[PDB]
Design a binder for these strands. Structure first.
Ligand SMILES: [Cl-]
Ligand SMILES: [Cl-]
Ligand SMILES: [Cl-]
Ligand SMILES: [Mg+2]
Ligand SMILES: [Mg+2]
Ligand SMILES: [Mg+2]
Ligand SMILES: [Mg+2]
Ligand SMILES: [Mg+2]
Ligand SMILES: [Mg+2]
Ligand SMILES: [Mg+2]
Ligand SMILES: [Mg+2]
Ligand SMILES: [Mg+2]
Ligand SMILES: [Mg+2]
Ligand SMILES: [Mg+2]
Ligand SMILES: [Mg+2]
Ligand SMILES: [Mg+2]
Ligand SMILES: [Mg+2]
Ligand SMILES: [Mg+2]
Ligand SMILES: [Mg+2]
Ligand SMILES: [Mg+2]
Ligand SMILES: [Mg+2]
Ligand SMILES: [Mg+2]
Ligand SMILES: [Mg+2]
Lengths: 197, 156, 106, 49, 127
RNA sequence: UUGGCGGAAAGGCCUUGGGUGCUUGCUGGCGAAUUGCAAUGUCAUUUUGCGUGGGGAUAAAUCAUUUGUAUACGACUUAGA
RNA sequence: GCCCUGAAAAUGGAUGGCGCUCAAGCGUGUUACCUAUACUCUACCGUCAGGGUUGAUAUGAUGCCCUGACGAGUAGGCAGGCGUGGAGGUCAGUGACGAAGCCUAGACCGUAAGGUCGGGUCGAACGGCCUCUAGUGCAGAUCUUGGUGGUAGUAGCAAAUA
RNA sequence: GGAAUACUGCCAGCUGGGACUGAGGACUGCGACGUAAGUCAAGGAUGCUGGCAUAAUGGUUAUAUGCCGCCCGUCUUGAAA
RNA sequence: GAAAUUGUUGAAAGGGAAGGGCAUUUGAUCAGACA
């Protein structure tokens, strides 16, 4: 319903989230994905590291700059899974992919906006307890991603600022709730309750 | 000769139509349409207005009044398929509407008799509206759909 | 008031199609707030208008309309089938359409 | 990756560096860094900031 | 100004063009039936051109009718025009291409007197 | 208009003071029609161009010539009011 | 039973791909839903079959009309039509006030072979209908003759002292 | 001991919403409703109303978008090869 | 004074061919009835 929907990628299974986002893009909805380094993949770390090595050894024999391109960043790994679920070689597919943005961390344009989650792709709601899973940030580092520490430091600074905002907002909410509480038991309040409000 | 004349020429007379077994029978309105019921217009110049339904005309049209003094909607005709019938009802007894028919709205600035008859009809309706609180303000406002509204779930 | 909308928002998804063949004469429409064929029965027969803009003005306007109607439901998730006087262009897959409340059975 | 934020230059530059900024030094009017040197004409608020 | 008729329906308005007539200049667009052993057009594979067939035949009640509802009759002189004197609601006169400019004036004047429609009245007009 | 904060792509957020318009928190008085029984019934933001006036600023590159740290040709690297 | 060991091939790689782990995997059960030139109903075209109707004064009894069923196709057979050169008859046909030919992302008719019209160019003959006749219809045959391209301003225009 | 309900089936029971279609063209038939005159949903659509009367609908053509489409001819069990 | 092929002008499209089929958008262009 929002003109732009911002998804917090923390705790989301990559494949199930990718299928949801791909359908949304083709339907005309703009999607922004943040914190791509916190995505989860089912299976233990060694299995997914082995899978990426199988992907790494595929390249054009006579020229390595022609073959498949292996992007190491967590955001681009999610992009690869998403592009496979879209007919990206068509004009309709190209237009859909222009409605998507993926970032590591939460950049300044979206750190003050609202973030939502996709319950269909949540790891806590999908995987049975005890099953092994892999964090996308750790997997990217082992295959040659260089900016794990930089994102971690910036995310720590953002959380400090966000905590101060919430403390101020929480205090204001308490005062507003008290005003509504003392405004109850009035003639207007009783009429609203009879009508459901 | 450029072209040889046709050997056979078809007929030039027009055959009459066969007798048609289609007899017109009076329309029956849906149960929600009762005189005095508040109606919501869905299209036209006054789309979104809330008016009072008064009389069913001979041409399958509905006579409505704003009243003109409340929301500026005069005595007009509307199609029954372009209105939404709410549950709010205003008493209509005491309103003279037998004079209005199809020929009254004949097509052929403002006519003098139309203004005078507007005030006669609206005088009785406005008196009845005053007996219900917030009814005059309700008719002055315009209906619209807000975010999250589901017409298939809303009750009117 | 701040809002004047008298229609329900909808999206043009695609044509009726099999895996490899499509049928441009029938378009699939998604209606906001409808997620069940039972709910979708309310909107059967309602008029659909597609509103778009052009640079050239013809009949005193630069806005053009393509009119249609809801015919039947589609699937189990509230999608409906619609037919237009002229078939909707394929470039409108993902564009917005307007579903009006007339003709009204309420 | 690393990104350059700002660059601050000295007030006076010799003709050796200014030649690097031209392809036709013998024809130019040598206007390079003329308006930038005006930043030092104040107390130095622009450079210090 | 002709006899009432049902709505004229064309089953296939598009021209039937010979296969590969847009590929080689030596192949004209005049329709020819492909007879090759491996031809995809003859075998009617999906995605290829359609071939003419008797199923496209037009309704006999509207066949040969112009959009105005008249059948076309070719006229070379006044005597040929007068054949349609009592058939003004079914036939329209068309002047032949090789009629001189001065002879078309006589035909048009006669046709207006008899109420006979002319499909090409602006040909060779010295306006 | 006062002040503070924000550099990950900050181009945003918060705050001081007064001026002014509106206020449906409540009570009133006039106006609407004729678009004729529906026809998006036109109210958004993209770029650019031509005429106005209120300010601001007064350069370079290439060819040709020249150099050999360069060079098949282009390119590259130097010099010349 | 499922999983694992047993289980080694050469360009990089394929449950179709992405990806999927109380599955989007395996075994099994219950419903909803999607869509073929198939099935049901209707219209139209054609084919075949069974029938009606000669009565003058208005034209086609090879006419008109009613009813039912049917429609894939190489090699091949048969039927009804379109187009070209010439010939008998006819339209007391068209034409220097412009015949034939040619050009024309202009118009109309026919399922199609094709036919007709407008505009431009052009300059001396040509067409409809009923019949007769054939040296009568081309995309191919490393087809014949003639003309013209891409290659391409390219290979190259460097032996014999200047 | 007495019922209810589930499941399966029947009704020449009633009733709301949506879509596609309108072939035919004087009368003739078989029925229905009525004492009767006649009427009717009974051998195929009529009635009422509005806008526009022109590029608005439509045709042609170029382009764009969705899906589909391998080079014809030939020999061959088999040809995009 | 046709075609292959070519120049100029005008219109349009062009991310490892072009061309085609069904449908509609946009641009250009055009016939028919005003009874
Ligand atoms: Cl050089
Ligand atoms: Cl033909
Ligand atoms: Cl396409
Ligand atoms: Mg590297
Ligand atoms: Mg074969
Ligand atoms: Mg199963
Ligand atoms: Mg057959
Ligand atoms: Mg001529
Ligand atoms: Mg041409
Ligand atoms: Mg001569
Ligand atoms: Mg021969
Ligand atoms: Mg040849
Ligand atoms: Mg051949
Ligand atoms: Mg040859
Ligand atoms: Mg050379
Ligand atoms: Mg040599
Ligand atoms: Mg020599
Ligand atoms: Mg059109
Ligand atoms: Mg394909
Ligand atoms: Mg063999
Ligand atoms: Mg072959
Ligand atoms: Mg000559
Ligand atoms: Mg040429």
């Amino acid at each position: 319903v929002e003109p732009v929907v911002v998804i917090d990628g923390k705790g989301h299974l990559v494949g199930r989230l990718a299928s949801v986002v791909a359908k949304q893009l083709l339907n005309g909805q703009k999607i922004v994905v943040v914190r791509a380094e916190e995505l989860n993949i089912s299976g233990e770390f060694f299995r997914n590291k082995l899978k990426y090595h199988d992907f790494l050894r595929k390249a054009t024999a006579f020229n390595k700059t022609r073959g498949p391109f292996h992007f190491r960043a967590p955001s681009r790994i999610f992009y690869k899974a998403l592009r496979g679920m879209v007919s990206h070689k068509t004009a309709r597919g190209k237009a859909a992919l222009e409605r998507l943005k993926v970032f590591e961390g939460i950049p300044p344009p979206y750190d003050k906006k609202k973030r939502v989650v996709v319950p269909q792709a949540l790891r806590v709601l999908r995987l049975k307890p005890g099953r092994k899973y892999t964090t996308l940030g750790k997997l990217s580092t082992s295959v040659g991603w260089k900016y794990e520490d930089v994102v971690a430091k910036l995310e720590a600074k953002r959380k400090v600022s966000s905590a101060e905002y919430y403390a101020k907002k929480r205090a204001f909410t308490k005062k507003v709730a008290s005003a509504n509480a003392t405004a109850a038991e009035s003639d207007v309040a009783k009429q609203l309750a009879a009508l459901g409000y | 000769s450029a072209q040889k004349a046709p050997k056979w020429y078809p007929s030039e007379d027009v055959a009459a139509l066969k007798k048609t077994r289609k007899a017109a029978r009076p329309q029956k309105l849906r149960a929600s349409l009762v005189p005095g019921t508040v109606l919501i217009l869905l299209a036209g110049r006054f789309r979104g207005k809330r008016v009072v339904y008064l009389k069913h005309l001979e041409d399958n049209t509905l006579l409505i009044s704003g009243p003109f003094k409340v929301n500026g909607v005069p005595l007009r005709r509307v199609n029954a398929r372009y209105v939404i019938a709410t549950s709010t009802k205003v008493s209509v007894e005491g309103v003279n509407v037998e004079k209005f028919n199809v020929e009254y709205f004949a097509k052929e600035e403002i006519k003098a008799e139309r203004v005078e008859d507007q005030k006669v009809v609206d005088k009785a309706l406005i008196a009845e509206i005053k007996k219900t609180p917030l009814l005059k303000q309700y008719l002055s406002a315009s209906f619209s759909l807000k975010n999250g509204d589901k017409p298939h779930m809303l009750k009117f | 008031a701040e809002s004047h909308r008298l229609y329900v928002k909808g999206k043009h998804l695609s044509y009726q199609r099999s895996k490899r063949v499509n049928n441009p004469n029938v378009s699939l429409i998604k209606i906001e707030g409808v997620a069940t064929p039972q709910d979708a029965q309310f909107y059967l027969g309602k008029r659909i208008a597609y509103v778009y803009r052009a640079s050239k003005e013809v009949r005193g306007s630069k806005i053009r309309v393509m009119w249609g109607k809801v015919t039947r439901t589609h699937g189990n998730s509230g999608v409906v089938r619609a037919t237009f006087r002229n078939n909707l262009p394929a470039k409108t897959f993902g564009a917005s359409v307007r579903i009006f409340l007339y003709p009204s059975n309420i | 990756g690393l990104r350059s934020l700002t660059t601050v230059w000295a007030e006076h530059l010799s003709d050796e560096v200014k030649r690097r900024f031209y392809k036709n030094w013998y024809k130019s009017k040598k206007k390079a860094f003329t308006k930038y040197s005006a930043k030092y004409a104040q107390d130095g608020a622009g450079i210090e900031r | 100004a002709s006899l009432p008729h049902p709505k004229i329906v064309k089953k296939h308005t598009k021209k039937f063009k010979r296969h590969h007539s847009d590929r080689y200049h030596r192949v004209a667009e005049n329709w020819r039936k492909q007879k090759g052993i491996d031809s995809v057009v003859r075998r009617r594979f999906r995605g290829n051109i359609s071939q003419p067939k008797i199923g496209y035949g037009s309704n006999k009640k509207t066949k040969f009718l112009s959009p105005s509802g008249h059948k076309t009759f070719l006229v070379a002189n006044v005597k040929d025009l007068e054949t349609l004197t009592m058939h003004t609601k079914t036939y329209a006169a068309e002047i032949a291409h090789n009629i001189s400019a001065k002879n078309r004036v006589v035909i048009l004047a006669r046709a207006k007197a008899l109420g006979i429609k002319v499909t090409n009245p602006k040909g060779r007009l010295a306006l």
